[PDB]
């Protein structure tokens, strides 16, 4: 399962 | 930085003249992402060419491959073209039956 | 079914004036690819891109295709972020890479964690070895480093490697585990070919084997003639299956002192060939 991506 | 791509023009099984077999175009090593890959018979193009996903590696570059039917004969030449923002000039690769 | 890797290939490009963003995230267990969400279509959803995969509900698709959505968005931002930090147009197309995941042991033990990001074909951001620092690669990039360290990113990385990743891997490893260990040994054989001239080309063939990783050497007499010889980068059938050659150039008459050998894990033991003028 892939991770939840945050801000740059 | 781009990244100008790596071609190679061979087909799928062994050839054989007057036995229908695949071709393929097998495009790595470029960035960006956008390519276009035209596959050619003879100097013209041919119309029904699948393409696979687009995938990258671990450098970041991407690859794909572009396929199309076909039997080879005796004289027929063919080749793959491709675009792409890293050239100047679209690079035509010709198929070798021995590579 | 030593090391083994769970590992997200995710893609975000801008194309400024035909359309929204192409968002693609791709799951690779052991390198090879299990599910794939592709933005591009209809209704996008996560997929199964084999068959083992289908085993999993229901429940579970949903649930990555809504979080797959909702990275989606979170690299639309971060593709504006980035026009700012480069003082970049809005009309140029850019690319977002990123690579995360983990490795295992054998014993299903943690080795490594990845969370790597890109911009335009080079390195952006990564999280280091510790799983606790950062490396920027540019001042762009320190911004980032500054905000995600405020933030504690590393430690949220930190607590889906150990865990989520770890123990997704080991489920995935054990509907997969049969079909990840097929093995597809080559066929091997030797070409000649001479354009009239006194040398002649002896080309070294393997195909339909799987997975990828392959050698091939040509040898003069017991040493291996790495300096001389010409090879492809492996390539795939189409089919599934890969190829992959090793010529060299000899002198005409002397084909029979060279020696041509494939090693590949789907073999018994090496194979060992020679040129075979046909019957």
Same mark, same amino acid.
């Given at each position: 399962?892939?991770?939840?991506?945050?801000?740059? | 930085? &781009?990244?100008?791509? &790596?071609?190679?023009?061979?087909? !799928?099984?062994?050839?054989?003249?007057?036995?229908?077999?695949?071709?393929?175009?097998?495009?790595? &090593?470029?960035?960006?992402?956008?390519?276009?890959?035209?596959?050619?018979?003879?100097?013209?193009?041919?119309?029904?060419?699948?393409?696979?996903?687009?995938?990258?590696?671990?450098?970041?570059?991407?690859?794909?491959?572009?396929?199309?039917?076909?039997?080879?004969? *005796?004289?027929?030449?063919?080749?793959? !073209?491709?675009?792409?923002?890293?050239?100047? *000039?679209?690079?035509?690769?010709?198929?070798? !039956?021995?590579? | 079914?030593?090391?083994?890797?769970?590992?997200?290939?995710?893609?975000?490009?801008?194309?400024?004036?035909?359309?929204?963003?192409?968002?693609?995230?791709?799951?690779?267990?052991?390198?090879?690819?299990?599910?794939?969400?592709?933005?591009?279509?209809?209704?996008?959803?996560?997929?199964?891109? @084999?068959?083992?995969?289908?085993?999993?509900?229901?429940?579970?698709?949903?649930?990555?295709?809504?979080?797959?959505?909702?990275?989606? $968005?979170?690299?639309?931002?971060?593709?504006?972020?980035?026009?700012?930090?480069?003082?970049?147009?809005?009309?140029?197309?850019?690319?977002?890479?990123?690579?995360?995941?983990?490795?295992?042991?054998?014993?299903?033990?943690?080795?490594?964690?990845? $969370? $790597?990001?890109?911009?335009?074909?080079?390195?952006?951001? @990564?999280?280091?070895?510790?799983?606790?620092?950062?490396?920027?690669?540019?001042? @762009?990039?320190?911004?980032?480093?500054?905000?995600?360290?405020?933030?504690?990113?590393?430690?949220?990385?930190? @607590?889906?490697?150990?865990?989520?990743?770890?123990?997704?891997?080991?489920?995935?490893?054990?509907?997969?585990?049969?079909?990840?260990?097929?093995?597809?040994?080559?066929?091997?054989?030797?070409?000649?070919?001479?354009?009239?001239?006194?040398?002649?080309?002896?080309?070294?063939?393997?195909?339909?084997?799987?997975?990828?990783?392959?050698?091939?050497?040509?040898?003069?007499?017991?040493?291996?003639?790495? $300096?001389?010889?010409?090879?492809?980068?492996?390539?795939?059938?189409?089919?599934?299956?890969?190829?992959?050659?090793?010529?060299?150039?000899?002198?005409?008459?002397?084909?029979?002192?060279?020696?041509?050998?494939?090693?590949?894990?789907?073999?018994?033991?090496?194979?060992?060939?020679?040129?075979?003028?046909?019957?």
């Amino acid at each position: 399962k892939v991770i939840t991506f945050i801000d740059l | 930085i &781009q990244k100008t791509p &790596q071609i190679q023009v061979y087909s !799928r099984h062994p050839p054989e003249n007057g036995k229908p077999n695949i071709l393929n175009c097998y495009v790595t &090593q470029f960035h960006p992402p956008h390519i276009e890959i035209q596959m050619l018979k003879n100097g013209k193009k041919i119309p029904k060419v699948e393409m696979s996903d687009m995938s990258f590696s671990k450098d970041w570059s991407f690859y794909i491959l572009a396929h199309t039917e076909f039997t080879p004969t *005796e004289t027929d030449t063919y080749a793959c !073209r491709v675009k792409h923002d890293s050239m100047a *000039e679209p690079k035509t690769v010709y198929w070798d !039956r021995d590579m | 079914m030593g090391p083994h890797s769970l590992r997200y290939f995710v893609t975000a490009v801008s194309r400024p004036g035909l359309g929204e963003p192409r968002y693609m995230e791709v799951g690779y267990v052991d390198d090879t690819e299990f599910v794939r969400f592709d933005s591009d279509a209809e209704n996008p959803r996560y997929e199964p891109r @084999a068959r083992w995969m289908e085993q999993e509900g229901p429940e579970y698709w949903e649930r990555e295709t809504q979080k797959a959505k909702g990275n989606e $968005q979170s690299f639309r931002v971060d593709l504006r972020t980035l026009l700012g930090y480069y003082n970049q147009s809005k009309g140029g197309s850019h690319t977002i890479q990123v690579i995360s995941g983990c490795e295992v042991g054998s014993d299903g033990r943690l080795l490594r964690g990845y $969370q $790597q990001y890109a911009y335009d074909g080079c390195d952006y951001i @990564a999280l280091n070895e510790d799983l606790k620092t950062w490396t920027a690669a540019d001042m @762009a990039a320190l911004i980032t480093k500054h905000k995600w360290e405020q933030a504690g990113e590393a430690e949220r990385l930190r @607590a889906y490697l150990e865990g989520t990743c770890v123990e997704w891997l080991r489920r995935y490893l054990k509907n997969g585990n049969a079909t990840l260990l097929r093995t597809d040994s080559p066929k091997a054989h030797v070409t000649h070919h001479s354009r009239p001239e006194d040398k002649v080309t002896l080309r070294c063939w393997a195909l339909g084997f799987y997975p990828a990783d392959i050698t091939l050497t040509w040898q003069l007499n017991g040493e291996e003639l790495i $300096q001389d010889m010409e090879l492809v980068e492996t390539r795939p059938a189409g089919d599934g299956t890969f190829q992959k050659w090793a010529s060299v150039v000899v002198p005409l008459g002397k084909e029979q002192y060279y020696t041509c050998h494939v090693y590949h894990q789907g073999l018994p033991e090496p194979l060992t060939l020679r040129w075979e003028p046909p019957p």
